[PDB]
PDB file of N, CA and C in Angstrom:
ATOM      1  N   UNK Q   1     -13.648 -10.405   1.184  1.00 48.36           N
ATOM      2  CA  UNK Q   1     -12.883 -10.327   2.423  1.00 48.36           C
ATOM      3  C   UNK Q   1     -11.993  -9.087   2.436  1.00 48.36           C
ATOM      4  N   UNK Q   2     -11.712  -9.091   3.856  1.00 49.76           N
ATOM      5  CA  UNK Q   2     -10.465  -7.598   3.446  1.00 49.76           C
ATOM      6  C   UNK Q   2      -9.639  -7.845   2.940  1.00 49.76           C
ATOM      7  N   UNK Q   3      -8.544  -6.691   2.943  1.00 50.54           N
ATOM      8  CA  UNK Q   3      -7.228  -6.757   2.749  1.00 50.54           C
ATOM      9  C   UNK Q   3      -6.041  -5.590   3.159  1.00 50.54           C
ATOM     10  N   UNK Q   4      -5.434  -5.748   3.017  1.00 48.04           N
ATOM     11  CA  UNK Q   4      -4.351  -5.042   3.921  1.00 48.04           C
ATOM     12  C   UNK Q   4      -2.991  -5.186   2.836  1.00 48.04           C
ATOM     13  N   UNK Q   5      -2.459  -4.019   2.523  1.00 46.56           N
ATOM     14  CA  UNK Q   5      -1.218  -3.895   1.623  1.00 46.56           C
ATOM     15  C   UNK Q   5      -0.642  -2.611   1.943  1.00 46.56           C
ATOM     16  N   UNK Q   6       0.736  -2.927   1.212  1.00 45.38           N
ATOM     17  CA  UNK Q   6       1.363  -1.639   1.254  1.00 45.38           C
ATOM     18  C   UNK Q   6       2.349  -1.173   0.183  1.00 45.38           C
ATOM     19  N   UNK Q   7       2.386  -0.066  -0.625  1.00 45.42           N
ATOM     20  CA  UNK Q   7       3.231   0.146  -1.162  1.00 45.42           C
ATOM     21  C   UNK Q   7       4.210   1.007  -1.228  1.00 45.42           C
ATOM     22  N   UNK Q   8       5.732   0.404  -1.926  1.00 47.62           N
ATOM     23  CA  UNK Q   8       6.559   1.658  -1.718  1.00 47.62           C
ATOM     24  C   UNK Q   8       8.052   1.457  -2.459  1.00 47.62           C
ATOM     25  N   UNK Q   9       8.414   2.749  -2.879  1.00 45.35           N
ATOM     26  CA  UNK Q   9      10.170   2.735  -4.010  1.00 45.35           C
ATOM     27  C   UNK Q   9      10.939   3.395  -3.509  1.00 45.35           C
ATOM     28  N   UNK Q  10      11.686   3.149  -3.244  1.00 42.87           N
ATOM     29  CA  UNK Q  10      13.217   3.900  -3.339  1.00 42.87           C
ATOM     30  C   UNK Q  10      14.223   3.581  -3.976  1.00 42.87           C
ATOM     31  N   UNK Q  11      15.236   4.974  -4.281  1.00 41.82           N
ATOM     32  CA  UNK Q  11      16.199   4.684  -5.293  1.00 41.82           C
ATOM     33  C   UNK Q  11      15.853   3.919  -6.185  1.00 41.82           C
ATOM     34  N   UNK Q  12      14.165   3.885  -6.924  1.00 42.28           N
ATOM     35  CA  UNK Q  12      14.008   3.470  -7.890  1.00 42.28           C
ATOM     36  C   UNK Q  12      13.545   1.786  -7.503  1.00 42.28           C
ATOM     37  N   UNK Q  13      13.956   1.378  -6.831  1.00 44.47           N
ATOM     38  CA  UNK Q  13      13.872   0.173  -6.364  1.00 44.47           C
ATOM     39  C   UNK Q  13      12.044   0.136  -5.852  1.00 44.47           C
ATOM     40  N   UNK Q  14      11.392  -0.836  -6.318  1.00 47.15           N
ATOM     41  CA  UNK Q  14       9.911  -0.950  -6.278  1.00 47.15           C
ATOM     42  C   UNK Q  14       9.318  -2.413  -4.991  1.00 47.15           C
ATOM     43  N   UNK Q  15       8.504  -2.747  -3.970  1.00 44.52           N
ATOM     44  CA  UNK Q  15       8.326  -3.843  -3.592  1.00 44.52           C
ATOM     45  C   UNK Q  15       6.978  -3.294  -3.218  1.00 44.52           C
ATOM     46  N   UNK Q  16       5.938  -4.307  -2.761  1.00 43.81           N
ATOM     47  CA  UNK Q  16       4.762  -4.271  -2.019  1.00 43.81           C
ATOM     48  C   UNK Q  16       4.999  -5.583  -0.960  1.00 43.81           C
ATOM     49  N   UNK Q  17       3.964  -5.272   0.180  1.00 43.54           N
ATOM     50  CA  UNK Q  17       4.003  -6.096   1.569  1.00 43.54           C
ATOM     51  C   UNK Q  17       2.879  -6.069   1.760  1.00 43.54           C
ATOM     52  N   UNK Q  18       2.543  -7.522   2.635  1.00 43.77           N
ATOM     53  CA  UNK Q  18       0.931  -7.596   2.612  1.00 43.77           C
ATOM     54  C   UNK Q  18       0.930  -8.470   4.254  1.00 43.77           C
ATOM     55  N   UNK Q  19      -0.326  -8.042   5.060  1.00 43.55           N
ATOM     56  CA  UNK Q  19      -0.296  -8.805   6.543  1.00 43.55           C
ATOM     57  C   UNK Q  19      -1.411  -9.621   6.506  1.00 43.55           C
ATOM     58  N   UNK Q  20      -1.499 -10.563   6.967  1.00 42.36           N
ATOM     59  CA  UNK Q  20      -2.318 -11.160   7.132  1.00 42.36           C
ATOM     60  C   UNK Q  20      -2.523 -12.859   7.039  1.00 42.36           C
TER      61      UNK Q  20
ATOM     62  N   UNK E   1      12.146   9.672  -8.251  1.00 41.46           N
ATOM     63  CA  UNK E   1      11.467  10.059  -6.855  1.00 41.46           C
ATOM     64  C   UNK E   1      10.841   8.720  -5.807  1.00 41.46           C
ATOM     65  N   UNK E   2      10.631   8.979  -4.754  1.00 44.10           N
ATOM     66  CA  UNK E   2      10.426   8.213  -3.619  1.00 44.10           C
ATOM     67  C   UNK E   2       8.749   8.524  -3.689  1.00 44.10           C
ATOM     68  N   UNK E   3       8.249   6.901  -3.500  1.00 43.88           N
ATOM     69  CA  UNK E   3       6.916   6.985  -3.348  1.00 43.88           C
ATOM     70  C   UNK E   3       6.132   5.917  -2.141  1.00 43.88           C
ATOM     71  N   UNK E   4       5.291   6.568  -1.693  1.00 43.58           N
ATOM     72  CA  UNK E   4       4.558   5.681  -0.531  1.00 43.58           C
ATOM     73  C   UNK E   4       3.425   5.814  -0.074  1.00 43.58           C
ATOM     74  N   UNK E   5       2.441   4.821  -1.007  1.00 44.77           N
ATOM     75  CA  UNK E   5       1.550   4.774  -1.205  1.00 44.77           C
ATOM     76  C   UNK E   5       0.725   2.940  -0.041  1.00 44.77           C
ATOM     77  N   UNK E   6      -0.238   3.338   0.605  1.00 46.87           N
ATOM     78  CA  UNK E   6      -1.098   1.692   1.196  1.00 46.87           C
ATOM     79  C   UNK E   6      -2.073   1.683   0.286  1.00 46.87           C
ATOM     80  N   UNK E   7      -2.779   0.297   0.199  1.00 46.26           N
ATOM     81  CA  UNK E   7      -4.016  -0.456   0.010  1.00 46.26           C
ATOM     82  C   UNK E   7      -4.711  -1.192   0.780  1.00 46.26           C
ATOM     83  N   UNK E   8      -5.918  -0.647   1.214  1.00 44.64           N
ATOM     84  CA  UNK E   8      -6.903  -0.997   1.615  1.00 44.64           C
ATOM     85  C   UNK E   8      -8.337  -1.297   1.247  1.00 44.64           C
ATOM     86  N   UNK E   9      -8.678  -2.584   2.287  1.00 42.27           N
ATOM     87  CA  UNK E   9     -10.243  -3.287   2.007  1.00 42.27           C
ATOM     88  C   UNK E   9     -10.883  -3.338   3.020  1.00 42.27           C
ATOM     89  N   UNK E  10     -11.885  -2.927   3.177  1.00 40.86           N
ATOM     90  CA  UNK E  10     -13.253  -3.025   4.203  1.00 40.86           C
ATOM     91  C   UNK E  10     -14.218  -3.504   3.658  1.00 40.86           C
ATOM     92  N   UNK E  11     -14.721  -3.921   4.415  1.00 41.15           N
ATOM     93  CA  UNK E  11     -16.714  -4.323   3.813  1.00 41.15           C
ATOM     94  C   UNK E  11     -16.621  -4.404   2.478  1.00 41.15           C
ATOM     95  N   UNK E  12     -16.032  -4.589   1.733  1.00 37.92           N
ATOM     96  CA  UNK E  12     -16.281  -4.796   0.277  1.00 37.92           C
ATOM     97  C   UNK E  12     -15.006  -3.375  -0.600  1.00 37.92           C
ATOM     98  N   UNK E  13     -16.094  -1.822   0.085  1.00 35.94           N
ATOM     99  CA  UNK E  13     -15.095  -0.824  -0.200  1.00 35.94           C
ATOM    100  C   UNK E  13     -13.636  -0.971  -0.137  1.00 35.94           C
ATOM    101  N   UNK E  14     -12.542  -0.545  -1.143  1.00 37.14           N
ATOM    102  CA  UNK E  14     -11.657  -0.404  -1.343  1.00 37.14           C
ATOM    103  C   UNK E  14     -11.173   1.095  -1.444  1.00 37.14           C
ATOM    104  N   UNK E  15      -9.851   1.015  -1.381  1.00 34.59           N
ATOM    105  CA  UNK E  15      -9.714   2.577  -1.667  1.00 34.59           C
ATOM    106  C   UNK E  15      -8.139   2.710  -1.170  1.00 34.59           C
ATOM    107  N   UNK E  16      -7.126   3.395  -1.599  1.00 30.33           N
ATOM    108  CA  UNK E  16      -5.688   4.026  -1.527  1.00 30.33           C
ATOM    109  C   UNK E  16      -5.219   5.377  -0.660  1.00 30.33           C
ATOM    110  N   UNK E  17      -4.058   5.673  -0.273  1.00 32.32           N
ATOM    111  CA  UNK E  17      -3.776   6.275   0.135  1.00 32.32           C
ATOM    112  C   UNK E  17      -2.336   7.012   0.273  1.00 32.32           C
ATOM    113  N   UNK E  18      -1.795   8.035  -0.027  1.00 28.69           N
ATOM    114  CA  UNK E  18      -0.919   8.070  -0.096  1.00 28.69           C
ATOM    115  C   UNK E  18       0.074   9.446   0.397  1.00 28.69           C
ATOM    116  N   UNK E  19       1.258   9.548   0.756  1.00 30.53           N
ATOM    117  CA  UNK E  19       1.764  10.642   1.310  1.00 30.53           C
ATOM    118  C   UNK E  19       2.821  11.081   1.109  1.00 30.53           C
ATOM    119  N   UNK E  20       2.949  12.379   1.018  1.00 32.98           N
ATOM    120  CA  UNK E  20       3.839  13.086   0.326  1.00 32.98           C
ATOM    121  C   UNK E  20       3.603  14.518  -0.109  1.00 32.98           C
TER     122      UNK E  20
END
């Protein structure tokens, strides 16, 4: 199946986000 | 440093992307 993500840091600070 | 990078899925293919 698909998928759909995203990543990203600032000030060192790290998270990922995902839709669906 | 600041980073911002997506993930993506199609049809099976996968593959990244990123800018900067």
């Amino acid at each position: 199946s698909p998928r759909v993500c995203i990543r990203v840091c600032r000030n060192g600070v790290c998270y990922r986000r995902c839709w669906g």
